[PDB]
Design a protein around this nucleic acid. Structure first.
Ligand SMILES: [Zn+2]
Ligand SMILES: [Zn+2]
Ligand SMILES: [Zn+2]
Lengths: 1168, 364, 115
RNA sequence: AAUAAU
């Protein structure tokens, strides 16, 4: 019934791109957006993209455009969302956010002309002159948005133009015209590729001059014979002018004053186009799904299907009348979903189903050579996921109760098809453990290898000399009669300084130079060559390295209120303007004051710092604060403050003699419910960041990509202290204390990239990964992959075959050849000679690991791997399948290849009496949908005997069982519910949803006693059904009744359950088809009802990005909203304490209780 | 023999769903004969309704009794097509190879109505004698009674199947209770033979097309039995009254060679008229998946495919079928269409295959 | 692997309880119906259902051996009173008519027993 | 056995 939706992995995969002036008019930026995310990238000159800002929307973007409005200092963004929503957003200096300028709703019921199912997406266009704009709404309404910043827009009934335009394909704003001219590529008389002998060429192009003031839109330059297969159209820039139409097997250039010039590409146009077409020489390609863009007025770059990159030149004479075309196959690249020419010499190839990569071109010595400069990690369409246990786990952590797992996803497609070994937390590879009692804090110094190691005890202090052998010292050179408060590197990794309550000592190494005596010191921070020590009463002293010898300089500070914390900073990249040294500071009254180290003039001030404002502008009980520069060359600083067992971390941005900087908070999921807590490591496996100790350890990493990443170390429980390490036996690695006083020498596992939001490894297979399954015995993964080959035979029936013979300008259809691999978790490299090659056309419809019963094992089950294939040979050849039951065995490994000890064993393979469209097991049986039925087989020695069959539906494509109940799923009709009574071999239909529905996948929502059937929809809806026989709508349980509803922002295809870290409730994780991972955690009635009030308050009394509505977004497609929104509920933690108190008092609950309810949903959702 | 299997197309669509987010990512099917495996069901290609203009001919299904077919209906799962002939026979044909399975004797009088309940369970019928019968999915008759004293021309279930409405040549529309099988109210007022009745998908309307020129179409109230409205749409003898599943349009089909799309919300303004039938339009079938596309069976045998928003016909087969078409039933997927005929026969039509010179006798 | 991390064997479900007791199962109407695909009565097997002929579920007897050939096709009207076995055991299937009388079996996917 | 092969 009740639940809460939480998002684990944000969607990956861009959809739109553009090179606009987002931040200011001086320098342009690359703005790329996925589904519900917008990223503004930079270019750092190796050429690496850097993330500038990211924003999340309560909607799925359907287009994007930019305008330089009259008098603006920026570029406005014309976002477009589903069902005719237009939002004009803009960057907002001083809040570092996306402000909204004008949001237009066009959801009148009369604009749709009575069409309930909307199959058209909005498409936003703009003039190159920045004079107008447009939007094709519902495919028949055109919202013209005039520009002088805005003017009262109007709607053009495109169907009521001088000629009614139907089935509009693409529309563009033209170049070099007196009035905004719009091209409309449309099909007045639609046709289909399979019906082209009676409707040969059905396309047209029309240009309409938009008169803004008089609202009159005449027609000029109409053409009415274009080939039927016209996919898109591009407007050639001003010097030449006109438009190019990207037919599937053709390319046109059209201008109003000159005849058309079209060239064919492949000889599939012989009888499908009567348009006068030439025959291109030396080129045979298809422009069916191909991005494109213009390098200059003459050349354009095309990225076809398959990723091949071409560079087409518009050969023209001195009259600028395009005379000829010239293609040339340049370096191939990813499958692109968008493209944009960033620089004079650069390009960007965005992609959703494959990593998006930035290119760079140079002239060959008319001809260009394309290199690659950067790529963006992309967990592409998550077709499948097979949760498994990591191969390597330290014997130290082998004794923990909670399971340690990992998920392997079938991401990408085609040439970019791969596997994604996703994990959530950091698992150290402990090398050596020392049982040291009492000591809690430590510091690793450098004397780059860490020469020493200083440990703090209650009364004494012992130092370990690391290197060849780690051994405690006994001689002089350090203070041992008392605890150490700080010990680090002063100078440039060439001097040693340790801080003691009685003073500060400067050491050159083993030896000690001199002792400077000094309210015992409680905290110290060092920024070379500046050392600052804070006493217990708030006194602050400054020390400088004056030649070496530390020098005393009392800082002039007026202590109106006592200083509670203080931090030291040293900026290398100029952002703290008006390298330089700054001493952050937090006062008792709540004011934060960035200072100047050389001088001491006040440079910043915030009136109420502990509150947690979402933006800090110039002029409780904060415990620790740390300001450190993270990123390439230490460019973008971050502020981390520990206040009232709650962590809030501020970014930094510039904004115009006080500091020309401002700090903005960033979303968060860390709850902390004198020993430092933020530990800065400069190089740990090649990473820089901060380690946050405490009850929930977390790792703060940000690479040259500039994007912040937070990773937890849940295994081994809380962490007391931490320190980086670099030894001869231990390479770049760390060193932390356990709650049980267990020092742990560790090293980060080397097979994972900690740049992604979740530590991931991409296993490029170079083929299409379809399924994945984990065999518990022998602990190996199986993978079903497909590779494309040209098709040279046409299956027929009478069997016979026909050979495909044509001319040399012919495009061969891509046939798929399937095969089942065996991926070893130990090295993530396929196992040689362990591969199953299926028949010629066999398409693996399903593949799962199945626990069929057996008697050899002590338990009643064995755990083979079961698959179901199917011969796809057109709609005219009867479709039949095969069940393939493979067991992974062990053999003596071949010498030199330890990974060849495994090998598939084909117990069973037979030609069934229909396609095996779905598979599952029930209490040790095998259930399989073979056509219009579901069978239930028993595992004999090497055969399968049938037990009970029943008829279900058209096409069952997803089955799953609990104990005796089978939850089928149909492509069109609905889910079902079938029950197996073991005593008598009968399969019975318990219930069945009575309404049509295009299902994607099914799973189970498990509560203590009730059982809900979580179902995913084509329209991106998540709903929970139930079997309640004592209700009225369901006669005797005959109907299944929906009890929960939710509209997720992405398609979901796979589910899996993990118990809450809550007596008998299970989480139901899913991975969306755009690289996202979410949860669905059940909840109690009281909790759901008392959080719905907070959700309503958040929806109503908060401003949202682009002015969107959260509540309207989540309404399904009648709606029974029993699923909370953990993404919208998260914004309550973002709010300051004052705003939290105000909203809580408004809704009638207390902030502490609301937090307790919110933080438990994170505590019990910390798996993987 | 011919065998139109939708499994390859459904598997191909299931494969595409993973990495194609709309039609904008769909790789272009080419008009070449070697592109047999690139098809997807109408569910895949959604913004190109052109594909489900089923003009390819698969096979002609005839009985050995040779009696005109008055109603054809597909089993809710599509497993087979049931055919109500003029002798009461219930011939069942396969749903994948369209081959004879079994011939029953359901009614003593010609079958005229056959509606499968909104759930798979039940299948109402009706014959020239007025009798109504209940059937299970295993073709076992469960109950029978006389609903009207004159031939029932149609029977339509409610959104929740507890009630169904029937129309008779007696000139009245009655509304019955499913389980009790007891008439509730007689919706009198048409004054002449009623030839169609369609229960609105959700709101609970009962529209009816009548042979009387004064009130050719009336809107009823299932509960109170009132007459919510009247509509003077056609000149004579509205043959088929069908409602769109979206709950907005009402498409009629009269004996004046015309089919008119009406908006139930606005009965004063005629929304669209579909000219192009050379003779009476005696059948209509909205598409299961494409809202806007529908077929049409003329009294000359012509079979036309229309769309809402397009002035001219999308394209059909004049002389698609000898005699006059009586009913049309799309396959639940929508990739096949069976046409009943007065010429003792029915025919199966499927989408064209890419790469065929459309020289068939029903095409050119 | 799904049954190892999260097991559903120690949880007594409301669905299990409901189907165990035939909860909310109203007697079917029209005594002449069949209602194929319905579970077997769990009460008639121990003592008695108490709703003979009106039961939503199926009442079974241990006498029939040959599998109903119409039930396979999905159209047999006798149903609860069918004189032939109603399970998928493919060892009591009828003997192939063509093999037994008209020589051999034309189709190679025949499930009828060949003797 | 009620059309398994119409
Ligand atoms: Zn019983
Ligand atoms: Zn039987
Ligand atoms: Zn045989």
């Amino acid at each position: 019934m009740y639940a809460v939706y939480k998002q684990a992995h944000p969607p990956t995969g861009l959809e739109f791109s553009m090179y606009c002036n987002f931040f200011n008019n001086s320098e342009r930026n690359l703005v790329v957006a996925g589904t519900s995310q917008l990223y503004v990238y930079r270019l750092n000159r190796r050429e690496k993209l850097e993330l500038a800002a990211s924003f999340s929307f309560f909607g799925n973007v359907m287009s994007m455009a930019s305008v330089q409005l009259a008098g603006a200092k920026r570029d406005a963004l014309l976002l477009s969302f589903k069902d005719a929503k237009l939002s004009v957003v803009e960057y907002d200096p001083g809040t570092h956010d996306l402000k909204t300028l004008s949001l237009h709703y066009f959801e009148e019921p009369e604009l749709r002309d009575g069409f309930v199912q909307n199959v058209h997406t909005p498409r936003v266009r703009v003039d190159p002159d920045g004079r107008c704009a447009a939007m094709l709404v519902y495919g028949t309404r055109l919202v013209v948005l005039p520009f002088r910043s805005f003017l009262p827009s109007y709607i053009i009934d495109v169907r009521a133009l001088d000629e009614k335009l139907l089935n509009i394909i693409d529309l563009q704003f033209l170049h070099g015209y007196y009035e905004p001219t719009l091209l409309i590529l449309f099909e007045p008389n639609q046709t289909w590729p399979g019906r082209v002998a009676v409707r040969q060429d059905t396309c047209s192009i029309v240009a309409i001059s938009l008169n803004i003031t008089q609202k009159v839109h005449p027609v000029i330059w109409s053409l009415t014979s274009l080939p039927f297969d016209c996919t898109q159209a591009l407007a050639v820039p001003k010097p030449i002018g006109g438009v190019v139409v990207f037919a599937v097997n053709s390319l046109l250039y059209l201008n109003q004053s000159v005849p058309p010039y079209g060239v064919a590409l492949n000889s599939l146009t012989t009888g499908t186009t009567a348009f006068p077409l030439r025959t291109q020489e030396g080129v045979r390609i298809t422009l069916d799904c191909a991005q494109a863009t213009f390098i200059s007025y003459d050349k354009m770059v095309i990225s076809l299907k398959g990723g091949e990159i071409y560079v087409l030149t518009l050969i023209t004479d001195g009259m600028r009348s395009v005379r000829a075309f010239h293609f040339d196959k340049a370096a191939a690249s990813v499958l692109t979903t968008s493209m944009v020419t960033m620089e004079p010499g650069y390009l960007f190839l965005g992609s959703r189903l494959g990593n998006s990569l930035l290119l760079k071109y140079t002239e060959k010595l008319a001809t260009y050579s394309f290199e690659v400069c950067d790529s963006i990690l992309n967990i592409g369409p998550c077709a499948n996921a097979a949760v498994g246990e990591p191969a390597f786990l330290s014997e130290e952590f082998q004794n923990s109760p909670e399971p340690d797992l990992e998920i392997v996803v079938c991401s990408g497609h085609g040439k970019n098809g791969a596997l994604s070994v996703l994990q959530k937390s950091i698992r150290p590879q402990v090398v050596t453990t020392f049982e040291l009692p009492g000591c809690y804090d430590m510091w690793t110094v450098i004397a780059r290898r860490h020469g020493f190691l200083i440990l703090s005890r209650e009364d004494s202090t012992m130092i370990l000399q690391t290197g060849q052998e780690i051994m405690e010292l006994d001689t002089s050179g350090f203070a041992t009669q008392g605890p150490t408060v700080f010990a680090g590197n002063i100078g440039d990794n060439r001097y040693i300084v340790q801080v003691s309550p009685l003073g500060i000592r400067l050491l050159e190494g083993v030896n000690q130079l001199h002792f400077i005596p000094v309210a015992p010191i409680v905290q110290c921070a060092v920024a070379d060559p500046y050392v600052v020590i804070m006493s217990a009463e708030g006194h602050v002293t400054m020390f400088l390295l004056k030649s070496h010898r530390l020098a005393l300089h009392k800082p002039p500070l007026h202590h109106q209120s006592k200083v509670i914390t203080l931090c030291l900073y040293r900026d290398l990249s100029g952002m703290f303007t008006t390298p330089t040294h700054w001493c952050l500071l937090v006062r008792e009254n709540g004011t934060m004051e960035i200072y100047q180290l050389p001088d001491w003039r006040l440079v910043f001030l915030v009136k109420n710092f502990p509150v947690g404002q979402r933006v800090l502008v110039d002029s409780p009980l904060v415990k620790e604060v740390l300001l450190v520069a993270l990123g390439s060359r230490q460019s973008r600083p971050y502020l981390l403050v520990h206040v009232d067992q709650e962590l809030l971390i501020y970014e930094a941005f510039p904004h115009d003699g006080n500091l020309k900087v401002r700090f903005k908070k960033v979303p968060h999921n860390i709850n902390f419910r004198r020993v430092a807590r933020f530990r800065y490591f400069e190089d740990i496996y090649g990473y820089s960041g901060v380690f946050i100790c405490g009850p929930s350890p977390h790792w703060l990493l940000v690479t040259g990509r500039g994007a912040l990443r937070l990773h937890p170390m849940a295994i081994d429980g809380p962490v007391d202290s931490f320190a980086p390490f670099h030894n001869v036996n231990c390479p770049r690695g760390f060193l932390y204390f356990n709650r049980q006083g267990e020092l742990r020498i560790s090293v980060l596992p080397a097979y994972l990239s900690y740049d992604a939001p979740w530590p991931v490894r991409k296993i490029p297979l170079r083929c299409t990964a379809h399924y994945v399954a984990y065999h518990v015995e022998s602990k190996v993964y199986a993978v079903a992959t497909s590779t494309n080959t040209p098709c040279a035979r046409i299956p027929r029936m009478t069997k016979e075959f026909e050979t495909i013979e044509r001319d040399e300008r012919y495009i061969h259809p891509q046939q798929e050849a399937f095969s089942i691999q065996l991926i070893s978790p130990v090295s993530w490299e396929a196992i040689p000679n362990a591969r199953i090659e299926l028949q010629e056309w066999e398409h693996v419809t399903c593949m799962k690991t199945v626990s069929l019963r057996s008697e050899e094992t002590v338990s009643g089950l064995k755990g083979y791997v079961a698959a179901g294939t199917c011969l796809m040979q057109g709609e005219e050849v009867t479709c039949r399948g095969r069940i393939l039951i493979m067991d992974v065995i062990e053999v003596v490994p071949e010498p030199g290849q330890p990974l060849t000890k495994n090998k598939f064993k084909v117990l069973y393979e037979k030609e069934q009496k229909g396609p095996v469209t779905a598979l599952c097991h029930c209490n040790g049986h095998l259930v399989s949908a073979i056509g219009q039925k579901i069978f239930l087989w028993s595992l004999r020695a090497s055969e399968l005997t049938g037990m009970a069959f029943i008829d279900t539906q058209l096409y069952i494509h997803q089955m799953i069982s609990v104990k005796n109940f089978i939850l089928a799923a149909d492509v069109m009709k609905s889910i079902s519910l079938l029950r197996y009574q073991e005593e008598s071999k009968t399969l019975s239909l318990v219930s069945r949803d009575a309404k049509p529905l295009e299902v994607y996948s099914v799973d189970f929502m498990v509560d203590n006693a009730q059982l809900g059937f979580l179902v995913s929809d084509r329209d991106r809806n998540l709903m929970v059904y139930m079997y309640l026989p004592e209700a009225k709508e369901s006669f005797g349980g005959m109907r299944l009744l929906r009890r929960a509803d939710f509209h997720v922002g992405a398609h979901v295809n796979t589910f899996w359950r993990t118990p809450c870290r809550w007596e008998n409730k299970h989480i139901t994780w899913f991975a969306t088809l755009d690289g996202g991972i979410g949860l669905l955690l059940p909840m109690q009635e009281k909790t759901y009802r008392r959080l719905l009030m907070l959700q309503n308050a958040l929806t109503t009394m908060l401003p949202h990005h682009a002015g969107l509505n959260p509540r309207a977004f989540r309404m399904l497609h009648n709606a029974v909203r029993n699923v909370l929104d953990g993404e919208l509920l998260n914004r309550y933690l973002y709010l300051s304490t004052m705003e939290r108190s105000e909203l809580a008092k408004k809704i009638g609950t207390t902030p502490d209780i609301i937090l307790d309810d919110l933080l438990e949903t994170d505590r019990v959702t910390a798996h993987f | 023999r011919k065998t139109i299997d939708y499994n390859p197309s459904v598997i191909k669509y299931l494969e595409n769903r993973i990495w194609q987010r709309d039609q904008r990512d769909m790789r272009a099917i080419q008009p070449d004969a070697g592109y047999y495996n690139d098809l997807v069901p109408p569910i895949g290609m959604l913004n190109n309704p052109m594909n489900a203009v089923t003009t390819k001919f698969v096979r002609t299904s005839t009985n050995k009794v040779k009696c005109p077919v008055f109603v054809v209906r597909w089993t809710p799962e599509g497993r087979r097509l049931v055919t109500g002939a003029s002798s009461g026979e219930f011939t069942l044909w396969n749903g994948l190879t369209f081959n004879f399975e079994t011939i029953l004797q359901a009614h003593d009088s010609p079958v005229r109505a056959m509606t499968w309940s909104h759930n798979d369970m039940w299948m109402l019928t009706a014959d020239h004698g007025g009798y109504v019968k209940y059937w299970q999915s295993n073709m076992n008759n469960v109950k029978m009674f006389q609903a009207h004293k004159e031939a029932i021309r149609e029977a339509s279930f409610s959104p929740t199947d507890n009630k169904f409405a029937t129309c008779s040549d007696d000139g009245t529309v009655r509304i019955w209770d499913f389980l009790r099988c007891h008439e509730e109210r007689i919706l009198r007022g048409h004054g002449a033979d009623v030839k169609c009745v369609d229960w609105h998908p959700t709101k609970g309307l009962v529209v009816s097309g009548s042979k009387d020129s004064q009130q050719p179409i009336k809107f009823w109230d299932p509960k109170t039995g009132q007459s919510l409205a009247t509509l003077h749409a056609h000149k004579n003898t509205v043959m088929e009254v069908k409602l769109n599943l979206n709950g907005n349009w009402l498409l009629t089909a009269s004996r004046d060679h015309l089919c008119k799309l009406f908006d139930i919300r606005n009965l004063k303004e005629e929304l669209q008229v579909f000219r192009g039938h050379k003779k009476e339009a005696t059948a209509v079938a909205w598409h299961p998946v494409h809202e806007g596309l529908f077929a049409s069976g003329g009294s000359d045998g012509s079979l036309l495919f229309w769309h809402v928003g397009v002035e001219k016909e999308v394209g059909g087969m004049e002389m698609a079928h000898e005699g006059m078409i009586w009913s049309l039933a799309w396959h639940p997927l929508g990739h096949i269409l069976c046409s009943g005929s007065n010429d003792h026969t029915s025919k199966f039509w499927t989408r064209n295959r890419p790469g065929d010179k459309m020289r068939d006798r029903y095409n050119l | 692997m799904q049954e190892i991390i999260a097991s559903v064997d120690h949880i007594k479900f409301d669905l299990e309880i409901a189907v165990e007791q035939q909860l909310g199962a109203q007697p079917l109407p029209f005594p002449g119906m069949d209602k194929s695909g319905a579970a077997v009565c769990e009460f008639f097997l121990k003592a008695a259902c108490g709703k003979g002929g009106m039961c939503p579920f199926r009442h079974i007897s241990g006498e029939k051996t040959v599998v109903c050939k119409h039930w396979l096709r999905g159209l047999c009207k006798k149903g609860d009173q069918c004189e032939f076995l109603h399970e998928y055991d493919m060892t009591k299937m009828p003997e192939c008519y063509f093999y037994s009388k008209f020589g051999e079996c034309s189709n190679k996917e025949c499930p009828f027993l060949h003797i």
